[PDB]
Task: structure prediction
Amino acid sequence: DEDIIAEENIVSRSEFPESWLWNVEDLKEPPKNGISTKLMNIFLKDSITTWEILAVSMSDKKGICVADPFEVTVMQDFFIDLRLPYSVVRNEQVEIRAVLYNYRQNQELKVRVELLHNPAFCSLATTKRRHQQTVTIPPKSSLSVPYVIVPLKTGLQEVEVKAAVYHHFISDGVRKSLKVVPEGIRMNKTVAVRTLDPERLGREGVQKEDIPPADLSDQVPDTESETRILLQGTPVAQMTEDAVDAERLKHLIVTPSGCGEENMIGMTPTVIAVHYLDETEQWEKFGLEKRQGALELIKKGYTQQLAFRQPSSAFAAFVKRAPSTWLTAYVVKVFSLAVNLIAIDSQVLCGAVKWLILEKQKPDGVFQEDAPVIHQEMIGGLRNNNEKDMALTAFVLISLQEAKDICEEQVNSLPGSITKAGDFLEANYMNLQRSYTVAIAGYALAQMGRLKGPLLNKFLTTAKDKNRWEDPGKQLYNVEATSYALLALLQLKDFDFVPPVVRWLNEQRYYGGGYGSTQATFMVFQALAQYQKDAPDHQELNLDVSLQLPSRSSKITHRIHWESASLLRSEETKENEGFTVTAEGKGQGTLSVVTMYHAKAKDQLTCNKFDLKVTIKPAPKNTMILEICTRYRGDQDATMSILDISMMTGFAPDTDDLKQLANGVDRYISKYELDKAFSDRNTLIIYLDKVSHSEDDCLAFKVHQYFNVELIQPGAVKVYAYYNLEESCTRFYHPEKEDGKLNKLCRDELCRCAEENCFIQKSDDKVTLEERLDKACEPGVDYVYKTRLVKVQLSNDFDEYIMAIEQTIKSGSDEVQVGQQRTFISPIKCREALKLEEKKHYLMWGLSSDFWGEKPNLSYIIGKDTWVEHWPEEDECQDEENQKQCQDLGAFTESMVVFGCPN
Amino acid sequence: SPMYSIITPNILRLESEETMVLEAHDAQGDVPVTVTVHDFPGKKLVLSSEKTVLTPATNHMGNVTFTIPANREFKSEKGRNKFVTVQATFGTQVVEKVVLVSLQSGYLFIQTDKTIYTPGSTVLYRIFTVNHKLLPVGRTVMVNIENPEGIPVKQDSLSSQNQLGVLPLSWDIPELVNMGQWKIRAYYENSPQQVFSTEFEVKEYVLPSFEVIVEPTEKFYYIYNEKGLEVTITARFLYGKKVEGTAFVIFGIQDGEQRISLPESLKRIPIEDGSGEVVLSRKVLLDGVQNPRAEDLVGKSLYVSATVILHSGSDMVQAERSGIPIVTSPYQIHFTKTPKYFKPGMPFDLMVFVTNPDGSPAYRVPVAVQGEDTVQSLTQGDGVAKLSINTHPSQKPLSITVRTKKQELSEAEQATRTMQALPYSTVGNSNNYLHLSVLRTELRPGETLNVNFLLRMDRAHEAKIRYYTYLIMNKGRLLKAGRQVREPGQDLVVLPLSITTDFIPSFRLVAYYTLIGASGQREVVADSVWVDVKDSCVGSLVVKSGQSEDRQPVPGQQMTLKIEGDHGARVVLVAVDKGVFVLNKKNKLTQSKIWDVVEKADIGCTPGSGKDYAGVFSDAGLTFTSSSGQQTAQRAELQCPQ
Amino acid sequence: GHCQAPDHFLFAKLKTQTNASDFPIGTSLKYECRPEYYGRPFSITCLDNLVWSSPKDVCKRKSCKTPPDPVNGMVHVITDIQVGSRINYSCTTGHRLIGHSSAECILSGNTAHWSTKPPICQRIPCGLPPTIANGDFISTNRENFHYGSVVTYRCNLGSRGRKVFELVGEPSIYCTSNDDQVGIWSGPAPQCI
Ligand SMILES: *[C@@H]1O[C@H](CO)[C@@H](O)[C@H](O)[C@H]1NC(C)=O
Result:
């Protein structure tokens, strides 16, 4: 044009990030009055907007600080705002908008605006021709320029528009991106659910699983898919019997007093109460201040007990009384358990043990009581048995084995005495008549691991109902014996037998702490503590899972443990493929495989709630009449609605006709557009109060063409509800184009743009022989045929010419033999320029990109590079005006057939 | 009878520096002290490592600073609570207390670059790893990313070591993705129980051309106002220029989580110079709902949805103001800053917090307690007003009713609330109390604060009090410990207290004196108070313009940026288009949120005082133990009672 | 009569015959902006005062586009984006640069396009963690490791479970780099014995 910057010289603004300046900076500046100051020279991006800057500081002294936001307003005097949606559907015709803003106070700008040509889009801008308008923008205003385009190839494409003003330095451009989504909808297809139990469901403890590819029958070609695999471990907890409520154990705290016997009777419940509450961790409901007090009581009991310790290291009731074997053994048994609690002198303990062995042990390995204890209620079930040799031998032996680890490396005669007594217990075991003795000697032998075979069977079969070891007599003996038996089971690690026993003990509701409750209390709480200590609360979980994907030679490894049970394993693959899962180890897993893809489902595209019919008709310069009829789909009439109307280029509504609508009831048009100039209204919005759901509500107005130009763009009509823009309907209108649709050629799911020239530029300039020869010898040119038009099949859109090929000059990638018919497709509107009629002959040539469908069934398309030249009939060659043409045709034909090209 | 006492924080934390207060009362010579920490129960010898010597001229008081090492966490999600045994020996005498343990290592904060993302884009996020002192620490941190359904789709384990407490991170949102609210979860390796989280939205969107902001004339609605709800619509371009267009506006009533639209409230208004007005009439409001009584609508909210459409018709932007309360009164009264216990015969200081229906603090609002005349007060900037009342010696609970005294309201529109306080119980009814009075408000670092110690007791034993022991608790730890001296006959003494940046956001001041009371009986009397400090950064961070103000910068032009901060610190930056925040302004990182998270993590559960000395200590988040047997109760609970 | 040879602007070019020194009154000469610059085509005329006309601001110099903020990277720009200017790229921490660090503002003479392409800074990868006997490491990630990833060791408990051996020597370790290269482990500490 006149005095204007060229389009090619304009570099459009491409950068529109939503976030940036992710920079990291340290302040090294020496402080002036405690404040360091760094200056940052940065680069503002292309976007016109206010940028908000948030900073966070981290210091090794002052810590973390979140600064207040800082705004920078980025703007120009004249600029383009290109408004594009998030995503557009492939092959569907849409209308985008470019809004030019001129904010200059007193100055109006004469503007040239141009849309660039992209192969990915079908527009009025061709390869050799631009689409450009010239519009005037008043000071402090804006102007919207509609563009109608059809997306072609999927993926992320680019839309670029440029603009420059006349007689000024002002210019601008916008280059954005847009996602082209194919037809369909996201659908989640669940592939496989596989339960993993390599122990139960696996062979050789190993379970391998085969997972096939997803169905994806209705998947859209070339679209992506994502397969997601989840490994979920399942925790299996075993019920552990209820621990004894600490509310019942409150009475077991007792201040130790009295002489050598009573002191132990009082020390007993306080010692075992700690032991149990420590393992059961019930102190919280018991209270934490009580423990140390109890520890003081224990220390007291021990200290007082040391006053009854004789020079022989043996213990007896009174210092004047002969030493008691059982009492000393029980003192050992208690102090052995008290090591975890209070400080205890190993010399006193191992000394008592040593005295026991070197004094009270008989040559047959039997321990004997020379001086019986005074309290016969503190010995428990040792009474009435008559088996007391065995019973006492067991008791003492147990007391010896509890003190072993402390006294083993001190007293040399300990293991000797242990095995010595053990032989004696072993030999006489099978003759036991009373369950109590079976239990105590049972536990006695179990610590040596010497309870095996027949003896163990005798121990197990003694239990009534496989729960309780009991004899006829007082209950406490049966409880104590059952406790001993529990210690025995736990020593031999038989957990199958255990739970019915513990269920019975707790069922007795015996918390101990009464007259002669010493043995019962101590042993039942020792046993019930060892139970909870050794009781598994879970089933072992170790999972070794491996994944073999045909797309990855790399081996995928995942290990699931019992602490991992909460954690979920996730793996993803973009390729749909069958894969193998190799699982091993204990535990129960769950495997889920689910794919997400694109479905071939149709249509998915429609005007949801709105029916819209647009009719543009010539009125009886040029004046026409645009009529819009609409009806809402629903049970009620819609609320306030919007009619967004664009204009065919060079058109404007009749300013007079608008007022009758605007002043009419139920219709509203803003005064902004009503008092606006006749020129520069290409966009008019009619606000409707309602649209009927029963019958069509229609309206019409006249449109004048103030500017005559070639190839005008169809106008658009968009109806929508104010609360929802997503639900709408879009219609186009053109006088010479059907339904406002642009010419585009589509078969299957693919479409190509028809908006270019129908064929090669016609003569003149008159074509010579060298021209045809050189042009047809171009490496790109594929086929050259001499043809005859058989029959013209017209349609609503595309014309199909049936051409029988009479000879093949040049052959392309298509295999076609002489005499075979072919079909040529041309856009309507090019039919009168082609002026093709039947029975006449023509010469055609084209490229390899013009084929319709796939080999070897093809249809030909006439493009801008397609050559069509009428071949005169033989009788018509005699005419004086056909001479040069016929000579050229024959020449070209035989030159091409016989000699071919030199290149 | 020399008495040995230990003061510790109520709850102990792992891998955090804790302090312990050692005291020897009425002793002679230099007393050595050894401090040991063990597992409960049994002996693991967690930290024996702190040894110190209490001496005269130090007035027999000393610090012990230890950091407890972490077993990490074996079990479990269920718990349960773990305790440790703190034991201290002075030369002979043993004093021990078992303390509850929280597994919290420190705080974690997550910053995302935007508030909303698109499928096929990248989410940039930083993780700030700090301790309880909010100082930077390198540690191991577990990170998870949860989809709307809750399934973590990505989990890693990272180390912030040598990163200076900042972990830069990124995640690529897939192209085939579930739309909704996505969540970034993170926690320390040693503490899976404490999880910090952030949200971000995935949606199909485009950045708009302009923004819409709707505002009511007032932030509530008065039920009897005939004018109805008045709403002003403002619509401005991103570059600050006003707009010309047409707006659609409609109202609605929100009750519970259920919303009900008002069909006849629909209005179409023109937008001129980036402004517009619309009014919801009381008639339409009361007609929309058939409930005939108007007063039923109180306690409900209103919402306005405005949709602005350009005159080009190309761009359309919607905005909403929700939670507009329908109230009988502009104000409400809250006691959450006032202690629930009083010292009989001593001045009781109430702090009344008056707020607007939106939660914003009211400014300059007259309040009083019936009854009547002598007391009156105006609400300050923080929205809190002080009312101090005299106290009767009686044991009857103090029932206080506070009302707003603002003029022009009909008393129907006056806000009222009733509280009750309970008498502090003393030892053996000795009637010996202690009153801590701190008056000044709007306190800032660098200021000094006079603390008034008022002693109440018979003058027979008054000469035996030569000191008060004071403790400054902050951020769940012990900030300071000290001794305020008292000469015989001094009933009210003053302690100057320097205020550093270490008192932010706020602090607690506890104080106690002990003496041998009637007939060889040891009495320990204590009191506490809570002081709010102005919320701010410890240091300073400013980002401003580096050039003179001439005109706006043009796209593509360079800009010099000025940053003002502390020496040696590391600064992380982000720049966001404001069109983004039009769509989502939620979950943005703010210092206020940080201090909020800290103030929610406080172990002190009460504004001050207590039912007794043990109550005073425990409520203020402290434990007091003595060789004479006087000690606090046991808190087994991790959270604050409610 | 007659205006002398016109002054040399040198940022604009005349392509047409200048065979003469003394030009007459009212004669338009066409000055097009030099290829190093860009501006609208204009024409200068004699004032009739023997002096040539003054151009308004028709012509301007050029620049090469907008430098993008790359993913996980910092762009240091000194001076301006004008032709012949240099800008630099730096990955701050935990990433290696693939590309050319120094970038140059260019003139190909038809149009300007950056000489080097924006580099990519990628997270520092690490090899397999050091393997020790009798014990294993636990993590959700095993096969593929990236910079900053921390792994923790443990000792195998067998089946029933028992305390076997002892965990010793700093079980937790992470990937790091003391140079910009493939990452190496902080230390090969752990043992189960
Ligand atoms: C403990 O003593 C140190 C000096 O050794 C002092 O810096 C610190 O402030 C004291 N701690 C408290 C809580 O007073």
